[PDB]
Write a protein that binds this ligand. Structure first.
Ligand SMILES: C[C@@H](O)[C@H](N)C(=O)NS(=O)(=O)OC[C@H]1O[C@@H](n2cnc3c(N)ncnc32)[C@H](O)[C@@H]1O
Ligand SMILES: C[C@@H](O)[C@H](N)C(=O)NS(=O)(=O)OC[C@H]1O[C@@H](n2cnc3c(N)ncnc32)[C@H](O)[C@@H]1O
Ligand SMILES: [Zn+2]
Ligand SMILES: [Zn+2]
Lengths: 420, 420
């Protein structure tokens, strides 16, 4: 009879992922295992954004004076959902205004467009306490945020590149449970919007054209556009057929005008850049919640905070213990605190545990299966003899391999490398 | 006639590192190049903390209700320097209370001590505007924070391990301008402190003993201890002989008591853990400021946002251009946005630029030297003939090497691997 929210709480209790406290309602605590997943997702997304999709990361303030939010139009649209800060300040619910400040700080040439900034800042929104639900709706969350500044003729290609990244995430790297794991909502001009209505109709026309050219299924979603522009909202469906907004792409002609943004064009004319807002995960928190809704805790290897467990058949057998300890040390790849040798960059480190509890071998196994370890590694007398480990995958326990220490090292590397 | 603050602003203007805006006084903006350095430092420290010094990273809320800060004793000690948050809330100036909440959420056995949590959360402190200076003193900053929960008999070894990490940073990996690049301030009981005076004298005795055993030079620093315990403050001296507090280690018997923290001991007795607070960089921002004070912008290779520049002698020569472009593509190691192949984990990517501006070769060189590129790579007709690049290091321009594409790839790898 379980809901998505309940599924998230069940997995979190089994794997020690997260916790909450009434001293900070709506703000999640990521415990070590929960934080490993969070950080892994961010590592993945940073790699795609920097070395494939042309983004440059920036780090921006969390609080801005009341004036910035008035200049942006946030203060009169959202201020009820905005935490005020007191010494006249607003705790940011969005990164965009900060990125406008960065754009307008230097002369900009058409030669550096499209200019793409990424930002993983924590955001706060004063969501009503009745709206709070697990990791899907929080008062504090992290967006894989990004703002693009381009020319009219670059809009289409930039949006298709955003859509390519979206497909890598939703239709290639991550399984979820249409052929596509999402549909698009075409979200149009809302009641309260800034800017002239002509510009708005043009932005909506550009977006519809791109939607049609993409060939992806979409739905009209009237009135749900941002206050600064219309958007494509990427909707995924949980197992209770309820839809959730994750990735989003927003076409913004309005903020550039309000920040008096300009760039020198090919003809030495000063012209306004167009701004595209975009997020792929949406928020890392909500994305994680939807992964869990699908995988029920059975993380893929590269993401799993429980990548492998090593289990000696006899916990008092020295030959088995040595062999198990040798492998754990190899796969964890840690250094001793006793010397001055630092951990080098780009080494591999795997989440590998050793269960030597004074418990029947059978129960230790069952324990590891409850935790969803990607791999179970057993060592008995025969394994000591061959100096080869019995290793089997979680979701295919019937088959198995007998591999050397070195072969497991390379196997785990290839898995993590390519997001298996 | 330059000050540290002025040096930071000069380097930042030359390398496009940071920016400020009056809409958010005391909060820094990290531009792409500035953010690269910031992120590199955090990557380095995470590796040491997770895979050498036994820390587990957590991610905690930024805002807590007034009650938490009252329970911790922060609200009556610091509340003037605390940004309040309004819907009864405090924007955190410290992570400790959150970590106490995490400790007390589960039954804890003596078997999991020392328990070590790390946290890179953004912190805010309402510093007086007259105290704001470059990156050394801000209203928003990131600590490489960490809290250790141990038993009385573990205190010494834990503090020596903290000191080992401090030496790796200040006396091995990073040059700065005593043999050691810091001295220690023994900071003692301040006017306003929580807890009984007997416990306080004991904490100070334990610390002095450890200080004496370490053999490191220290100075009495009366009254400057935290309100929860005495501390060892690691002081570095800028080139104007002014001292700055960076790393710190704080011995805390007090917070555990106020959060009713307990763990089951060897004898099934419930006992209070001791808490050690510690930071190595102090804040990433202030550490960066002190690096800049020393290096004057001449970053070591692994940290440099300008790792190499490739300069064709003749910008209209196709043979030279091809050879230059081949190398840039190799070293950057990017993927095209046009396919579904993701950037894999643990690949190498170098910050390598190509200067093909229509400018005399001589001036393009001079330009790169102004920016402090770690390596200058020149390609003329002879280099095309040999298919070998003329590569020279920044701080040793007189000598040079002629290397193939492959040899530069491996060279740059070895440099970044081992923090050269
Ligand atoms: C995309 C940005 O550039 C733009 N300023 C923006 O904030 N768009 S948004 O309002 O639609 O937010 C983007 C994503 O953040 C996620 N999100 C929004 N609110 C919350 C919340 N209260 N809790 C968790 N995630 C949220 C959603 O997935 C949403 O699609
Ligand atoms: C070390 C923590 O666990 C403890 N709660 C703590 O905050 N100690 S601290 O107050 O001494 O802060 C640690 C380091 O942060 C840095 N820091 C403190 N205030 C600022 C500031 N306003 N701007 C930049 N860095 C700061 C200093 O380097 C300082 O040594
Ligand atoms: Zn935005
Ligand atoms: Zn602390």
């Amino acid at each position: 009879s379980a809901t998505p929210a309940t599924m998230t709480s069940m997995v979190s209790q089994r794997q020690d992922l997260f916790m909450t406290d009434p001293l900070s309602p709506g703000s999640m605590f990521f415990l070590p295992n929960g934080a490993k997943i969070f950080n892994k997702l961010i590592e993945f997304m940073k790699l795609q954004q920097k070395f494939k999709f042309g983004f440059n990361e920036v780090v921006t303030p969390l609080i801005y004076k009341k004036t910035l939010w008035e200049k942006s139009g946030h203060w009169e649209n959202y201020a009820d959902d905005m935490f005020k800060v007191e010494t006249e300040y607003g705790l940011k619910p969005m990164n965009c205004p900060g990125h406008c400040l960065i754009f307008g700080k230097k002369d900009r040439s058409y030669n550096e467009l499209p200019l793409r900034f990424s930002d993983f800042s924590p955001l706060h929104r004063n969501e009503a306490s009745g709206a709070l639900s697990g990791l899907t709706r929080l008062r504090k969350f992290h967006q894989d945020d990004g703002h693009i500044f381009c020319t009219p003729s670059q809009v289409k290609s930039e949006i298709f590149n955003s859509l390519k990244l979206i497909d890598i995430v939703y239709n290639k790297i991550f399984p979820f449970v249409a052929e596509s794991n999402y549909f698009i909502n075409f979200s149009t001009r809302p009641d309260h919007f800034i800017g002239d209505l002509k510009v708005w109709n043009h932005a909506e026309q550009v977006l519809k054209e791109i939607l049609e050219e993409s060939g992806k299924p979409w739905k009209l979603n009237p009135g749900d556009g941002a206050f600064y522009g219309p958007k494509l909202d990427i909707m995924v469906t949980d197992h209770l057929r309820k839809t959730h907004q994750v990735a989003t792409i927003q076409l913004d002609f309005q903020l550039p005008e309000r920040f008096d943004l300009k760039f020198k064009d090919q003809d030495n004319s000063y012209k306004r850049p167009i701004m595209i807002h975009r997020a792929t995960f949406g928020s890392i928190e909500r994305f994680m919640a939807l992964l869990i809704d699908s995988n029920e805790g059975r993380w893929p290897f590269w993401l799993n905070p429980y990548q492998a467990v090593i289990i000696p058949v006899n916990t008092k057998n020295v030959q088995q213990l040595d062999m198990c300890t040798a492998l754990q040390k190899k796969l964890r790849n840690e250094l001793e605190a006793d010397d001055m040798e630092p951990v080098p960059l780009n080494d591999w480190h795997f989440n590998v545990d050793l269960d030597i509890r004074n418990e029947p071998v059978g129960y230790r196994i069952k324990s590891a299966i409850l935790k969803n370890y990607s791999y179970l590694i057993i060592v008995g007398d025969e394994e000591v003899q061959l100096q080869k480990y019995n290793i089997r995958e979680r979701d295919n326990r019937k088959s198995f391999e007998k591999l050397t220490m070195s072969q497991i090292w390379e196997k785990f590397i290839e898995l993590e490398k390519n997001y298996k």
